[PDB]
A paper describes a structure:
To strengthen this hypothesis, four mutations were inserted at position 76: D76A, [name], D76H, and D76K. While D76K resulted too unstable to be purified, the other three variants were structurally and biophysically characterized. The crystal structures of D76A, [name], and D76H were determined to high resolution. Analogously to the structure of D76N2, these structures do not show any major conformational change compared to wt β2m. However, although the backbone of the EF loop is well superimposable between the structures of wt β2m and the mutants, changing the residue in position 76 alters the H-bond network within the loop, in particular in D76A and [name]. The last three C-terminal residues (residues 97–99) are the only stretch undergoing some rearrangement upon mutation at position 76. The side chain of Arg97 presents different conformations, and the strength of its interactions with the EF loop and to Trp95 varies in different mutants; residue Met99 interacts with Ser11 or with Arg12. Such observations suggest a role for residue 76 in determining the interactions within the EF loop and with β2m C-terminal region. Similarly to the [name] mutant, all three mutants display a decreased stability and increased aggregation propensity, confirming the key role played by position 76 in determining β2m biophysical properties. A saturation site mutagenesis (D76 to E, H, and A) allowed us to show here how position 76 is indeed crucial in the β2m fold, any mutation at this position results in a notable decrease in thermal stability and a remarkable increase in aggregation propensity as observed for [name].
Residue numbers in the entry: 0 to 99
Amino acid sequence: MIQRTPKIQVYSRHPAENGKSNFLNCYVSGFHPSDIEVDLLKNGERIEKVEHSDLSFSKDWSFYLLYYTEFTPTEKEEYACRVNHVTLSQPKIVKWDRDM
C-alpha cells in the first residue's frame, strides 16, 4: 500500500478567449488513495455549483484533481479550498491569496 498527502494550490485564471470571466481553481495533486473530498468555500461556506471537476492519474498510485468554477470576487470576500483525505487528520483549508 502507499498513501500520499495531496498538495493543494488555490488560484484564479481568466480564459484567454473570454478574459472578462474569472475562475477560482483548486488543484489537488499527487495524492493516494484516490478517495477524497474537495470543496470551494466562500466566506467559509461550501460553494454548491462547481462546474468543472477533472480527475486524472499518472502512475497508478498518483491522482490529480482540478476543481474549478466561474466566480466574481470582491475584496471583502474570502475564498478557499477545503480538502479531506485519509492522510489529513483534520480538513485542510487553503485560503485563496487574492493576488494569485
